Amino acid sequence: ALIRKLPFQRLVREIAQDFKTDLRFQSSAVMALQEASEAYLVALFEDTNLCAIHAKRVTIMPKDIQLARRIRGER
């Protein structure tokens, strides 16, 4: 919905290529990854905004995104 499908599907294909040649995703699998990517990034932005607010800033910065990746679990 927020992400357009075809460029997203190409990225998925390129990434999957680095793991195993000649391997397609079912349309439902790509859709599942898209929906999950949207949910992941929305949640990351929620934490990112919180970080900025706590820093007394109204503008999010790359540091806020990296810290949100630590505040949610990292790995």
Binding site: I15, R24, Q26, S37, F45, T48, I60
Partner: protein, 82 residues
């Protein structure tokens, strides 16, 4: 460095929509590249696992079931201890 390295899966307007959806009001211009980098790590981790399950099932086609399970590895994050 080369074209393949710079292939993207989310556009700049999409990044802005996702940011608004997450409650963001203003952004550094450096946020587009940052967000793209974070997305690529997320997808590499999930797809790596999805592919492992597909291979063990003697398949060449990745299914939603492989993706759904791979997506559990990130854990479940909430506010508070409920």
């Amino acid at each position: 460095k080369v074209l393949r390295d710079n292939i993207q899966g989310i556009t700049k307007p999409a990044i802005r929509r996702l940011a608004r959806r997450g409650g963001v009001k203003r952004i550094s211009g450096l946020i587009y590249e940052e967000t793209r980098g974070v997305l690529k790590v997320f997808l590499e981790n999930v797809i790596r696992d999805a592919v492992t399950y597909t291979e063990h099932a003697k398949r060449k086609t990745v299914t939603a079931m492989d993706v759904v399970y791979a997506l559990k590895r990130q854990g479940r994050t909430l506010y508070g201890f409920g």
